[PDB]
Amino acid sequence: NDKVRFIKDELRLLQEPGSYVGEVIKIVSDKKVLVKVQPEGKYIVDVAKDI
């Protein structure tokens, strides 16, 4: 039963459009963060509710 599940988890996990590596320029206290993304532009983005 576990084995069936393991293979399945890989099949889901490997389907992704990829996430961009970026650098926090500075922290904002409205729970936004400023990130200068390596290949993209610069964006101010909404930090995770749980982060």
Residue ranges binding other proteins (CB under 8 A):
10-11, 13-21, 38-39
Question: Alpha-carbon distance 18 to 2, whole Å?
Answer: 27
Nearest-angstrom CA–CA distance, 31 and 21: 20
Tokens of 10: 């890989």
Q: Tell me whether residue 18 or residue 51 sits nearer to other proteins (CB atom).
A: 18
**Which amino acid, residue 36?**
K
- Least separation in angstroms between residue 29's CB and other proteins is 26
How near is the Cβ of 45 to other proteins at its closest, in Å?
A: 15
Nearer to other proteins, 17 or 26 (CB): 17
